[PDB]
């Protein structure tokens, strides 16, 4: 069902003798050339929509004092991370899809795999931290606390460490980076058992530390937040403002949580399925589906966490409309 090599796994059978190294020749047996072109189209769209939105976010923060508050530090970190995803991953995949394999070879595979995975984990953990921070200021879990600059900076550092924790180890033998799907982009090898790199234990660690923990924290933090807000409103029903604030805070949480799930449940979904069923067969186009969801977050996370933020949105509109409005 598959062909193996020293640094790769092509999901196609070499019984016809047709398979080549994804580092050396096109994979047009894996998929038609047009399907490669459509990949490149999707890459192009992600860069064309992703870069402006994420860049613009940084650009207005330079332009507007009000944006440069601690509680936004993490949303900035999000945008940077998203940009690592576009220039680390998307631009490269665009280049390679048009060749039909991974031209840059193994060393490139690791570069591309590291930075693309770094970005994604940073963004992910930023989402978690933001919820932790929100939880702390709104729910006031600890007396005599005021969230400041030096806390915000910890939050950021924490993201970068947790992302390093995921992206770094494959570079040094615990798991590995190899082309996935149509072999134009490189990712963590979570589908083949590579005893030499202990893939299995890493896939466990990843699943536990970098999916169920985030998921629990997000659900707990926002769960409490919604509870606190609902409670306050219930006791202050004379205030229509507070009732509005409650409804809107609830709506955003549902969106954020549903969005988070759309982003990571497919990746976690198939990884679990491949882990549990080791005997299985998996197409190239099937393997790209979890990726498709996770990567598109570079566009939609900013939309949710930034463009739907009244403050950022205003500054963006004035900056975009040459000042005023």
């Amino acid at each position: 069902n598959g062909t193996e090599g020293p640094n790769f796994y092509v999901p196609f059978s070499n019984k016809t003798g047709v398979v080549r190294s994804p580092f050396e020749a096109p994979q047009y047996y894996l998929a038609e050339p047009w399907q490669f072109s459509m990949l490149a189209a999707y890459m192009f769209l992600l860069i064309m929509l992703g870069f402006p939105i994420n860049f613009l976010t940084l650009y207005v923060t330079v332009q507007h004092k009000k944006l440069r508050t601690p509680l936004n530090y993490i949303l900035l970190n999000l945008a940077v991370a998203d940009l690592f995803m576009v220039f680390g991953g998307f631009t490269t995949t665009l280049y390679t899809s048009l060749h039909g394999y991974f031209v840059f070879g193994p060393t490139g595979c690791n570069l591309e795999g590291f930075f693309a995975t770094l970005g994604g984990e940073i963004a992910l953990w930023s989402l978690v931290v933001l919820a932790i921070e929100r939880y702390v200021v709104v729910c006031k879990p600890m007396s005599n606390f005021r969230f400041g600059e030096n806390h915000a900076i910890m939050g950021v550092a924490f993201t970068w460490v947790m992302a390093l924790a995921c992206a770094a180890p494959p570079l040094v033998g615990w798991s590995r980076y190899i082309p996935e799907g149509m072999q134009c982009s490189c990712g963590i090898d979570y589908y083949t058992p590579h005893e030499e790199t202990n893939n299995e234990s890493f896939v466990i660690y990843m699943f536990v530390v970098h999916f169920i923990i985030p998921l629990i924290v997000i659900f707990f933090c926002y769960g409490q937040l919604v509870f606190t807000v609902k409670e306050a409103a219930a006791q202050q029903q004379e205030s229509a403002t507070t009732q509005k604030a409650e409804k809107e805070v609830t709506r955003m949480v549902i969106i954020m949580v549903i969005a988070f799930l759309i982003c990571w449940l497919p990746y976690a979904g198939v990884a679990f399925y491949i882990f549990t069923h080791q005997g299985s067969d998996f197409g190239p186009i099937f393997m790209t589906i979890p990726a498709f969801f996770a990567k598109t977050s570079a566009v939609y996370n900013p939309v949710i966490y930034i463009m739907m933020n009244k403050q950022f949105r205003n500054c963006m509109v004035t900056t975009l409309c040459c000042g005023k409005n």
């Binding site: 929100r134 200021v137 805070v249 933020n309 403050q311």
Partner: peptide, 7 residues
């Protein structure tokens, strides 16, 4: 300040 969370 609490409402500055995003809204």
């Amino acid at each position: 300040d609490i409402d500055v969370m995003g809204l």
